Amino acid sequence: EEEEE
Amino acid sequence: EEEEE
Amino acid sequence: EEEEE
Amino acid sequence: MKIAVLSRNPRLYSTRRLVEAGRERGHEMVVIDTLRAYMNIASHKPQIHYRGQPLEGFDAVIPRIGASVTFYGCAVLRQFEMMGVFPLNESVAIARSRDKLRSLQLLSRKGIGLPVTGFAHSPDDVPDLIEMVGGAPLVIKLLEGTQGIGVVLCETEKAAESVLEAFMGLKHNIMVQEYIKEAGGADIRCFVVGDKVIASMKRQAAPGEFRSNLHRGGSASLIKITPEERMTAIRAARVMGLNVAGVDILRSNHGPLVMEVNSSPGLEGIESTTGKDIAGIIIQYLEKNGGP
Amino acid sequence: MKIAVLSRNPRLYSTRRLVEAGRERGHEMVVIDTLRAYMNIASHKPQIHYRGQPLEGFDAVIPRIGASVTFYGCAVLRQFEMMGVFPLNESVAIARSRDKLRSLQLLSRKGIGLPVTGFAHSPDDVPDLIEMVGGAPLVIKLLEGTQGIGVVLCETEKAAESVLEAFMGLKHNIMVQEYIKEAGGADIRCFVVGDKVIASMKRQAAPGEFRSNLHRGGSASLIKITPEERMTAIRAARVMGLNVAGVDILRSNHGPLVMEVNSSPGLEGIESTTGKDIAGIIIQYLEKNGGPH
Amino acid sequence: MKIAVLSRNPRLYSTRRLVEAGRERGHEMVVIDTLRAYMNIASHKPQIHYRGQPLEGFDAVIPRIGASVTFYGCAVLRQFEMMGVFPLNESVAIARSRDKLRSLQLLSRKGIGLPVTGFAHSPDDVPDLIEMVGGAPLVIKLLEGTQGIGVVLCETEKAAESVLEAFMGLKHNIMVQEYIKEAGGADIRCFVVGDKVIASMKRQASASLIKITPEERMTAIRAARVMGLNVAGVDILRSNHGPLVMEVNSSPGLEGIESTTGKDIAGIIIQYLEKNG
């Protein structure tokens, strides 16, 4: 979710 | 995790 | 203790 | 019956299994994401809305309310209760069990076996607090409202002094407990439904690690519980006002000590170890108490 | 009597006044900083320690537990209760009143007059939520556990849509209430002790400002409350299980509506407006219910 | 090469693919959970420990540092840099790009196309702020440190006034932007590696292929170079005043762009490390 913004 | 404590 | 430390 | 399951994730083992077991037995099972329910609390027109539509015709509700959303989850459950829907566990009981300080004081008052336990926030005399609970070694638990943040073994007085000094001014609530070394990193999970322990298991922590959660990478096995453990688990649930509860017990030299009373216990560990249809037994409980 | 006052600051108007009033009436008044009390929770010889020593010979306790420390404050109060010390307000009642969602649902269930009120966290359909509670104008409150974080008046549908979308990114609990325009920015504070309103005042918000706090720049005056308002204030306190409560009431077109039930009401506003010894009346309540009898 | 991937989850599409692509091309790929690395900074020789052992013989590192762990992730990356390990993106550039206020001020100063934009925290004159950015409708973005918390359309002056009044005293940093209605809910994601857009897609509120203009291509490349990033996702809105940069991401996802274009993006990133480490 976060390391792929 | 949280609902399966 | 923020802009006076 | 039409049964709501208040769960934030319908893919979770316990939620899936409750839905599966309900459908095997001819019930309409609907998973409601607790946080996506919104409500009118007007007495002349009470509503629970969900994705633009009202929720109608529910006979019972199974609350699987995570600790981080206790206040809102209890508001959604309370609303179901006010609308005549039968709760597996009552809102007041779930709220009570999630307040760890209140839970321990109630279990203590009712003569349930507990580790020697102290509470603090900003104590001026840390050595006095450490002496009160029988000195080191002791376990320090860090609480923020309705959530456990950490659990720490302090082997010496100076280690207890350092943890307490560190947490003073971090605005956490602090539990100090005698270390039950004689348990050897094992605890007993008793699955309570009504006035019965329907299943139990031993959880063993990996060698070194004292914290024995299956979540924290510890192994599980069958166990024959003592009549005293059986009675303690049942009484702890009844004292909390819960119909369905996981009760965690440490085998101490002064008999069984209750560590946890959980209003939303996991099914994965207990079902894979015992082979029992726990989900089914829970559905059966709703049939006998909430439905035709 | 020996009376504990659970207060984090003994210089606060209300704590000072309770200590003053207690001493005028021959009581030993001891201010206990709630967070500096620590305890062994054994049933069989129950004790509270404070600055290295046990607390002994307390007859009663006045909880002034701030909302940020409700859980720990209620644990210290519960311990006093288990030791046979008489609480001005019970721990279960203070905890209940600090859970705003639970308070509203209980008052509603017991047929106490309330503004039309909605709860949400992460609703998929904001327009549906706004419609449910009767549309704009409405007041939107942000709650984090036992604490109010923010309050906005949203005069239009689009303003309500924007505030709710904004607050949904904070992952807090959201209260939506109809704005009671017919009150004309006035509310009644009723000070309840036992089964009586012992004092009341009208708070008028400054023109523009919708919040009628004296903190938010609003004026206060004396008021004669109706028998229905009097009964509503008393019932709200009894329903919450509180012996002492501040109850805030709006005069609406559907009768008196309860806005707030406070377990730890301020004395400054009500005392300076009425001139009444409210602190004294509270001490009197403890004498009649918690003391030698 | 021996290549570290700083990622908290090795099961994530982008981390899996970078590991896969590296191994196809004969490299030793090691996923390091950023938060499980601990370090001695002061002493005779800079080292990073991980699960009881030092990390040795790394040639390059691919930082996939999530926004919530920017400070610690940049400290671990900075340590790799001090030990002579080649970073895909430099620590200073990742830190800069995660500070949204600083990023916009830098892109603005360097003449990159931006929506008309205002900053506020506790403004005394909300109507003045709303007028400054060209009035309603406008978008309000809420920032807490290095993280975007929400994005909200305010269709009217009164809706903008209410959101700003609500957030005043909530201790968030506030961005106010002109609403680019003419984009019709579409944006362009340009995947930049070195001085090239190697892939792009249209996102509609679904994803599709797109032919970007020479101006959009140049804007994406310049935005990355200005931020000091070798690898960046640049998000662009097609406005009536040309392409406007919305986002420069130091750790762009591969799933959306790879499934839409069919291109080996992971491979091209590994190729970049081969040519420059």
Next chain:
Amino acid sequence: MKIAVLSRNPRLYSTRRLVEAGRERGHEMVVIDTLRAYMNIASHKPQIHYRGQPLEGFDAVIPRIGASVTFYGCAVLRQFEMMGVFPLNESVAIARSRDKLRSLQLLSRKGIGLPVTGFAHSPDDVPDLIEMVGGAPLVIKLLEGTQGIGVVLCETEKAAESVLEAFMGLKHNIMVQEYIKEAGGADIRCFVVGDKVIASMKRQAAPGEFRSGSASLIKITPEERMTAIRAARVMGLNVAGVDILRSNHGPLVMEVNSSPGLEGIESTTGKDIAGIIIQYLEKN
């Protein structure tokens, strides 16, 4: 000159004194509440608005940006810089100094004396971490972004183990430092202005408490003087409070503060520090 002071409270000792000193010396001193400034970002005619009006004709700005508002304060300061206003300290230097992890790594890289220091978040091997930094006794600091949250002296290995296990559940950044016992609870605060230490004081912690408590005059060594000046220059700061421990391995930098207090240093030395800061702005 017209000088802006970015301060959230004009009644604070340091802000009052800077305003006082500026006015004694014929300057127009304006206190700007950092959070009440709002801005349009545009390279052509860059402006800052405040209470409905633009801020115009400012020659210099003194940033007193509190650690909790570093990002927004640096955005307001950066805007002043882009408009050609002279900053007492640069935005990039203030941001750098507020990132404690980055500050230590930079000072270390430039050979400035530091306590042996480790960083951790969720280490799997706590005993290894404790061994790496030379074992107990050690000081354990909790960091959340640009703010220090907590400080603990751990006298024994078991106390360090317990504190680290406790703090690992808070999901904050963890600093571990060797305890400099030989300092006997004293530190030196060196007030640096333009590559000179203009004033210094010894701070002594109350008996028991290891965290600095009383203050006194001190004659600093040439090595301490050079260390304080170099630490400020390495951070890129013209005005800095540098805290130094007298260790058995020479002077160790504990803290480089971009917004040092004036009350402690002025009441102990009797020096017009506010004045010297104003003088720096006049000369530059």
